Write a protein that binds this ligand. Structure first.
Ligand code: K
Ligand code: K
Ligand code: K
Ligand code: K
Ligand code: K
Ligand code: K
Ligand code: K
Ligand code: K
Ligand code: K
Ligand code: K
Ligand code: K
Ligand code: K
Ligand code: K
Ligand code: K
Ligand code: K
Ligand code: K
Ligand code: K
Ligand code: K
Ligand code: K
Ligand code: K
Ligand code: K
Ligand code: K
Ligand code: K
Ligand code: K
Ligand code: K
Ligand code: K
Ligand code: K
Ligand code: K
Ligand code: K
Ligand code: K
Ligand code: K
Ligand code: K
Ligand code: K
Ligand code: K
Ligand code: K
Ligand code: MG
Ligand code: MG
Ligand code: MG
Ligand code: MG
Ligand code: MG
Ligand code: MG
Ligand code: MG
Ligand code: MG
Ligand code: MG
Ligand code: MG
Ligand code: MG
Ligand code: MG
Ligand code: MG
Ligand code: MG
Ligand code: MG
Ligand code: MG
Ligand code: MG
Ligand code: MG
Ligand code: MG
Ligand code: MG
Ligand code: MG
Ligand code: MG
Ligand code: MG
Ligand code: MG
Ligand code: MG
Ligand code: MG
Ligand code: MG
Ligand code: MG
Ligand code: MG
Ligand code: MG
Ligand code: MG
Ligand code: MG
Ligand code: MG
Ligand code: MG
Ligand code: MG
Ligand code: MG
Ligand code: MG
Ligand code: MG
Ligand code: MG
Ligand code: MG
Ligand code: MG
Ligand code: MG
Ligand code: MG
Ligand code: MG
Ligand code: MG
Ligand code: MG
Ligand code: MG
Ligand code: MG
Ligand code: MG
Ligand code: MG
Ligand code: MG
Ligand code: MG
Ligand code: MG
Ligand code: MG
Ligand code: MG
Ligand code: MG
Ligand code: MG
Ligand code: MG
Ligand code: MG
Ligand code: MG
Ligand code: MG
Ligand code: MG
Ligand code: MG
Ligand code: MG
Ligand code: MG
Ligand code: MG
Ligand code: MG
Ligand code: MG
Ligand code: MG
Ligand code: MG
Ligand code: MG
Ligand code: MG
Ligand code: MG
Ligand code: MG
Ligand code: MG
Ligand code: MG
Ligand code: MG
Ligand code: MG
Ligand code: MG
Ligand code: MG
Ligand code: MG
Ligand code: MG
Ligand code: MG
Ligand code: MG
Ligand code: MG
Ligand code: MG
Ligand code: MG
Ligand code: MG
Ligand code: MG
Ligand code: MG
Ligand code: MG
Ligand code: MG
Ligand code: MG
Ligand code: MG
Ligand code: MG
Ligand code: MG
Ligand code: MG
Ligand code: MG
Ligand code: MG
Ligand code: ZN
Lengths: 87, 155, 50
RNA sequence: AACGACUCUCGGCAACGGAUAUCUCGGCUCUCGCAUCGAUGAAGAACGUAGCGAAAUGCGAUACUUGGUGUGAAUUGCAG
RNA sequence: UUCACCAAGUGUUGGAUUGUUCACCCACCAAUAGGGAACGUGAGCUGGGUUUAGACCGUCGUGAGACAGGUUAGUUUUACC
RNA sequence: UGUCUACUAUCCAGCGAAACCACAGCCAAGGGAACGGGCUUGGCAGAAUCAGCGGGGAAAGAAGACCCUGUUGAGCUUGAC
RNA sequence: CCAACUCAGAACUGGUACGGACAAGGGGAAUCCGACUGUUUAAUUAAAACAAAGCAUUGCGAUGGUCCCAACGGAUGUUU
RNA sequence: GUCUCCAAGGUGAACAGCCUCUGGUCGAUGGAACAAUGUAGGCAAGGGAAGUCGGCAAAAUGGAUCCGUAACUUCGGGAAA
RNA sequence: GAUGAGUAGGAGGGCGCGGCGGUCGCUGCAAAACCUUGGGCGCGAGCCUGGGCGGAGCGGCCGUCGGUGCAGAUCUUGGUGGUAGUAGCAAAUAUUCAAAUGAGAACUUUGAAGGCCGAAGAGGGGAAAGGUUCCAUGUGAACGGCACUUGCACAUGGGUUAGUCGAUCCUAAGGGUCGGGGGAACCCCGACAGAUAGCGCGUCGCGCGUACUCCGAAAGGGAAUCGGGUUAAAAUUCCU
RNA sequence: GCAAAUCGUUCGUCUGACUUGGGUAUAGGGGCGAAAGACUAAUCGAACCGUCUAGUAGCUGGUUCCCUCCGAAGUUUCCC
RNA sequence: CCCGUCUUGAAACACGGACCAAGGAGUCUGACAUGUGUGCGAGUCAACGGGCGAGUAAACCCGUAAGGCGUAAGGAAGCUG
RNA sequence: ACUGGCGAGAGACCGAUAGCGAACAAGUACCGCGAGGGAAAGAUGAAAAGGACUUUGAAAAGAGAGUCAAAGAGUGCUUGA
C-alpha cells in the first residue's frame, strides 16, 4: 500500500505561496518560507548553491530603481534644473 | 514533382501522388504490389471487390502471422491474403484522380494500365502507451507516400 | 475549490488570460520568429502548482 | 526447377534521417576605464497597462508612455 | 533349486512411516533386476527439505552473536525469436 | 478420465508495442579452454507459409547476494587501541 | 363500535415436495505453544514473536529521583 | 487511493442476498467461427484420501421450531457440544 | 656483398586534420562539401583525376603550433532496423429496430423495445484538491490507444449578484512575541528576572487597574430569510 | 499487469487497547516505535537536496594513422 | 571458425559488441635528470624594474659593488682551505 | 587586489552534440510537497516575387499552369552523408 494507494491521499498542502518570493514554498505550520526564509528579515542565501544564487540575484528581475542610477551618475546627480528653451 | 520512374511516353501518360497518408505502410505496399501492370478498369473493379470481401489482396513480404484464405490462392499459392480496405480506399482515390488527369489530357481511358506504382514510408507519428510497472512505450503509426503512373496501351 | 482566497483567484485569472493563441498578425511582422505560443497550458495535462 | 513469389545481392531513381561544407547581432579568454543600491522605501515578488498582444522588452491608473532638449520626416504586420 | 550360454524382444506393480535419496514393513505378482541420458527433466509442475530477512529451545560466548543441532512462518518471473 | 457454459486463443476490419539481437541457426563422432551452429570426418540437404510446443540456443532478466581477495566500507558489540 | 399481528392446533391436498432461488456452522478424540481481547515486518514471515492484567525488584521526601539542553533554562509537574 | 449528508416497495430477523419504482444508464472497439492449451463456473457411474510433504482444492454442514446434549471446568463455561 | 618471424616494448622515416608566420596559386567560364559500375598512382597511411550535384569560397609548398586521426569503453547524444502488421484490444450481464442528419453512421440525435445500477446506487449534494473542465455556437488537422457528424479536444463568445449562506468574531491543542536571561552571530527560552494594557464615571478631573487588545476552527462556540417565480449557463445572493 | 502490490473467491474483527477527517506537536545519529531494525513522501541497519568532489582505488573496462628496423619477461633480493 | 579483451591457453558453453552518424582518452604546469640543437664562455643570464616603441601586450636599449647558477673544498661546529 | 556591477578594446580561442546551462519569448518549458533539478530549439530567396487561374476530390491534396537565375530554394524551406 506504500505506493499507488498511498499517493491517493494528497489533499493537504504543506507549502503555500510566499508573500515575499512568490514560490510555492511557504511552509504553513512552520510559518516559514523554505526558499527565502520569510518572515526572517534577511534573505536565505547559501554559497553551496551557485545556481540558486544566480536564479534570484540582482538583475534577474526588473531593477526598477537601480537601472537608472548609472544615468544619473553620469550627470553627477544634477537636479533642480532643465535644458535652456529652444530658440 | 519528380516520380521515381518516368513514363516512356510522357504525352500518353498521367499520374497522381499522395503524401503522408494515414494508412499502414505494410498493408499499402501489399495492395500496390497486387496492382502493378494491371489495366485501369480491372484494377478499379479488383479494389472494389476487396472492399466487398469478395477478392483478397495477397501478402507476400509483410506476411508473418497473416491468415490463410481461399480467395488468394489464384494469385498466391500458399493462400496468405487479407482485405485491407483502408489501403484500398486511398489507392482507389488516387486511381480516380489519375483518371481525371487523363481526361484533361484527352487520353484513351479504356486502354490505360498501371505502368508504375510504389509506396514509400513517410514520417512516423508518435503516441504513447502505458505498460506494467509504470513504464511508457512508443505507440507509433507508419504513414506512407504513394505515387502511380497510368500509361496508354500502345498497339 | 469554491472557497478560495482573493489572491488565488486573481492569479488564476491571469493564467486564463495568458492561455490564448498568439495573434495572427504577429507572424507577419518583419524579422519574426514567433511561430506559436510555447507556454500554452491545459488544465488536465500540466498543473499550476498552487 | 522454366515463369513467378520469397530471400540475398549490385546499380538507377524515390524515401527516411540531419551528418558534412559554408555561415554567426552568441560564447569563451586577456587587457583597460570608472565607483554609482536602500526607511527620500532598495534588490526581489505580485498585479495591471496597447485600436487590434499571449510571451519577451517597456511602463505604473499620466501605465510599450508624459515633459524638456537634440535630431529634422516618419511608424509599419494591419487599421486609422 | 543352483551354475553357465545365446539373449535387452516384452514386462518389472498397489500401499503404511520419512522432505527425503537410501531404508523398512504389509500385499499382489510370471517377476516385483540394476543403471545412464548436465547425479535426464523448475520459461514442465511442486516447494516438503536445504539455503536471506520474523520467532523459540538447547549448548557455546562477558557481549554483539555462533551451531555439516532441533523447531515454526516465509513472492518460484518472461517465449511472440 | 469424460463432458457442459462463458471469456480468450483462433479468423477478419481498424489500431499496434516490448524484451532481445557478434554473425547466425539440421545432426553424429572427433579433437579442442576437457559439453560446438561454425573447425575435422561422416549422415545428409529442395521455394514460400499456418497453428502449437517447451528438447536445445550451457535463452532472457542483474558487472554472483554464496565463497575468496583488497593494506575498501558500513551496522552492531566488548576485556581491542 | 373500532382494531393491528404474534403464537398454538386441526382437516384436506401435491410424483415425500416444501429454510424448494437467495441465504446460511461440518462434527468428534487428543498433543505442542500462547492465558484471554489487543498489536506486529505498507510491497514474500500474523506467529509460539510484541503488548497485556497479575507478580517482583530498584531509585527518590523537592538543597530530590529520571531525563532534555551550546548556554540560559526546561520535561516528569495543574505533580508529592 | 480519497472525508461526509439524503435513502422507496417486495421477500426476510435484517441499510444480507435476489427482484422492482424515482433518478441514472447500456460507457467499456466491433464482426465471424466454436480447434488445442488456458482462465472462470459446473457435473459425473462404482470406490471414498488409495492422491499428496500435508484433505491443498472442492464437497458436505448451514435458517427456524420442538426434543436432547458428555468429558472437563477457574462453576462463569464447554454448547449451536 | 650479405640478409628478411615477431606479442609486450623502443625508435626511425612518412600519411592525414585545423590554425599562425611566409610563399606560389585556383574560383560564378562554378570554390567547399557530398555522390559515382569513370580512370590512374603508392607496399601502405593516402594521393591525383573524369562525370554528377552544389552555388561561394579553397588549395599547394617552407617553417611553426594544436582541444590533430576510433570498431569496441553494459562508451555519450541523435537517428534507424530485425523482432512485427507480431504480443496484444477479453473484469464491471446487452443490445435490437425504424427514421432524421451527414461525403461518410455498429459508435451522433429522436422514438420504440429489451437489459442493468436497485436508495451503504452506476441516484441527488457538499468538504478537500483542481481552476474554467461550466454554457452556447462552430470546427482543417492533432488528441479522445477502433471509429465519430462526436467533445471534459480545438476556436470564438458568454457566465459566479448576499445586512440574513460562509469567511470575518471567539477561544482549543498549540503558534508567534515584548521585557529579561542566554548567544561570536545565524539564533535559544517564551509574560519565566517587568513603572501592563488600559477601562469606568463625570467634565480635563476622580475611581479602578494580576505584563501579551497578537495568530490559531469554511466540521468546536456563534446576531438575523422564508416560500413562489426566473437563466443556454447564477441564486436562501436575481424578481415579487 | 487494470495496478512499481491490483483482481477473484476464502478469511480476521466489528461498543472497543474501536474506526476516521481536520487542526496541532516531535526532524536525520535525530524523531517515532504494543519492538518487525519497523516507520520517517514508491528512499531507512541512519531519509532527501546542494556542496567539499573530477573524493581515493595495488581492482574492471577502454585507450584513435602507415610502413621500416631492433626486440623481451614470468627469474634474483627487499617490502603488513 | 568472430572481432576486441584478460589469459599458460579463446571459434569457445569466458566477457563487450543489433545497426549508422557525430563526439570520445598520456594533456597542461612546477621541480629535477640524461640526450641533442643553438648562443656565449670563466663566465653566463634584460628575469623585478626602468628607457622606449610597430600611435605601440611585439620589437629594440639599460646590471652602475643587484641577484641566480658557476668560479673551492672539507668539517656537527669553532675553523682551516 | 579585483571570475561582481557599468563602460571599452582585443584574441594563433569555440563555430549550433562546439562555445556559458542558455546564439532563439533560458534560468524559459517541464519535474519535485520542498531544499532543488533543468532541457530541446539558429540558415527560403537579392527581392515574398510565399504559387493567380483551370480541372478532380467531402476535405487534405493531386494534375496542369504561374513567380524565380533556381522550386532539383515552396514557410523547420541553403547544402542534404
Ligand atoms: K495467422
Ligand atoms: K532485385
Ligand atoms: K535500390
Ligand atoms: K557545420
Ligand atoms: K516602493
Ligand atoms: K508585462
Ligand atoms: K522624450
Ligand atoms: K523450459
Ligand atoms: K503464513
Ligand atoms: K486486424
Ligand atoms: K566433443
Ligand atoms: K549499515
Ligand atoms: K475482539
Ligand atoms: K526535577
Ligand atoms: K478452449
Ligand atoms: K491422504
Ligand atoms: K597559404
Ligand atoms: K572520384
Ligand atoms: K601546417
Ligand atoms: K469540493
Ligand atoms: K456578509
Ligand atoms: K467557525
Ligand atoms: K463543545
Ligand atoms: K424570495
Ligand atoms: K466484515
Ligand atoms: K543521517
Ligand atoms: K594489489
Ligand atoms: K577481458
Ligand atoms: K575470464
Ligand atoms: K561475447
Ligand atoms: K654574476
Ligand atoms: K640595469
Ligand atoms: K667533525
Ligand atoms: K546545452
Ligand atoms: K537550392
Ligand atoms: Mg517508505
Ligand atoms: Mg503538516
Ligand atoms: Mg503562521
Ligand atoms: Mg497468433
Ligand atoms: Mg497498458
Ligand atoms: Mg503508476
Ligand atoms: Mg491529475
Ligand atoms: Mg513544480
Ligand atoms: Mg517594448
Ligand atoms: Mg528391456
Ligand atoms: Mg506421509
Ligand atoms: Mg555420474
Ligand atoms: Mg540433475
Ligand atoms: Mg528445463
Ligand atoms: Mg522455475
Ligand atoms: Mg528439480
Ligand atoms: Mg519450504
Ligand atoms: Mg530465518
Ligand atoms: Mg551464558
Ligand atoms: Mg521449514
Ligand atoms: Mg553435435
Ligand atoms: Mg553457440
Ligand atoms: Mg562438413
Ligand atoms: Mg527449407
Ligand atoms: Mg528450451
Ligand atoms: Mg510456451
Ligand atoms: Mg548472453
Ligand atoms: Mg562481479
Ligand atoms: Mg555486485
Ligand atoms: Mg582495496
Ligand atoms: Mg596485500
Ligand atoms: Mg570501519
Ligand atoms: Mg504433556
Ligand atoms: Mg495469543
Ligand atoms: Mg500493519
Ligand atoms: Mg510482509
Ligand atoms: Mg501475510
Ligand atoms: Mg502467574
Ligand atoms: Mg546548563
Ligand atoms: Mg416481514
Ligand atoms: Mg435489503
Ligand atoms: Mg463419483
Ligand atoms: Mg454415486
Ligand atoms: Mg463412506
Ligand atoms: Mg497416503
Ligand atoms: Mg503415494
Ligand atoms: Mg480447504
Ligand atoms: Mg468440544
Ligand atoms: Mg621483421
Ligand atoms: Mg588542410
Ligand atoms: Mg556503391
Ligand atoms: Mg593536402
Ligand atoms: Mg583549437
Ligand atoms: Mg581529442
Ligand atoms: Mg563509431
Ligand atoms: Mg580498439
Ligand atoms: Mg553500446
Ligand atoms: Mg541510444
Ligand atoms: Mg525498433
Ligand atoms: Mg493478434
Ligand atoms: Mg488481456
Ligand atoms: Mg471479441
Ligand atoms: Mg463487460
Ligand atoms: Mg457501445
Ligand atoms: Mg446484480
Ligand atoms: Mg436489477
Ligand atoms: Mg446511512
Ligand atoms: Mg482513435
Ligand atoms: Mg460541456
Ligand atoms: Mg480548451
Ligand atoms: Mg450566518
Ligand atoms: Mg494555549
Ligand atoms: Mg521564534
Ligand atoms: Mg528581547
Ligand atoms: Mg508575572
Ligand atoms: Mg482579539
Ligand atoms: Mg483569530
Ligand atoms: Mg461552526
Ligand atoms: Mg447551479
Ligand atoms: Mg481493461
Ligand atoms: Mg536534538
Ligand atoms: Mg502501532
Ligand atoms: Mg533481526
Ligand atoms: Mg547528494
Ligand atoms: Mg615492515
Ligand atoms: Mg583460467
Ligand atoms: Mg579471441
Ligand atoms: Mg566449450
Ligand atoms: Mg569481466
Ligand atoms: Mg551483449
Ligand atoms: Mg569521429
Ligand atoms: Mg643540455
Ligand atoms: Mg653580486
Ligand atoms: Mg681545524
Ligand atoms: Mg572590474
Ligand atoms: Mg549548446
Ligand atoms: Mg561542427
Ligand atoms: Mg546563398
Ligand atoms: Mg534542403
Ligand atoms: Zn519566500
Amino acid at each position: 500500500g506504500k505506493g499507488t494507494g498511498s499517493f491517493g491521499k494528497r489533499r493537504n498542502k504543506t507549502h503555500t505561496l510566499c508573500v515575499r518570493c512568490g514560490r510555492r514554498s511557504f511552509h504553513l505550520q512552520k510559518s516559514r518560507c523554505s526558499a527565502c526564509a520569510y518572515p526572517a528579515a534577511r534573505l536565505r542565501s547559501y554559497n553551496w548553491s551557485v545556481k540558486a544564487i544566480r536564479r534570484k540575484t540582482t538583475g534577474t528581475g526588473r531593477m526598477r530603481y537601480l537601472r537608472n542610477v548609472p544615468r544619473r551618475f553620469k550627470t553627477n546627480f544634477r537636479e533642480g534644473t532643465e535644458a535652456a528653451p529652444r530658440k | 514533382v519528380k516520380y521515381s520512374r518516368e513514363p516512356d511516353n510522357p504525352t500518353k501518360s498521367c499520374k497522381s501522388r499522395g503524401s503522408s497518408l494515414r494508412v499502414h505502410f505494410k498493408n499499402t505496399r501489399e495492395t500496390a504490389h497486387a496492382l502493378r501492370k494491371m489495366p485501369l478498369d480491372k484494377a478499379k473493379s479488383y479494389l472494389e471487390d476487396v472492399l466487398a470481401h469478395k477478392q483478397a489482396i495477397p501478402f507476400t513480404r509483410f506476411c508473418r502471422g497473416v491468415g490463410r484464405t481461399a480467395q488468394a490462392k489464384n494469385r498466391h499459392s500458399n493462400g496468405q491474403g487479407r482485405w485491407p480496405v483502408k489501403s484500398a480506399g486511398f489507392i482507389l482515390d488516387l486511381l480516380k484522380n489519375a483518371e481525371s488527369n487523363a481526361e484533361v489530357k484527352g487520353l484513351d481511358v479504356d486502354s490505360l494500365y498501371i505502368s508504375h506504382i510504389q509506396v514509400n514510408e513517410a514520417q512516423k507519428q508518435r503516441r504513447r502507451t502505458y505498460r506494467a510497472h509504470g513504464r511508457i512505450n512508443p505507440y507509433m503509426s507508419h504513414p506512407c507516400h504513394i505515387e502511380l503512373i497510368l500509361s496508354e496501351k500502345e498497339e | 475549490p469554491s472557497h478560495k482566497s482573493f489572491m488565488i483567484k486573481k492569479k488564476l485569472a491571469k493564467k486564463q488570460r495568458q492561455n490564448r493563441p498568439i495573434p495572427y498578425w504577429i507572424r507577419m511582422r518583419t524579422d519574426n520568429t514567433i511561430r506559436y505560443n510555447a507556454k500554452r497550458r491545459h488544465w488536465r495535462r500540466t498543473k499550476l502548482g498552487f
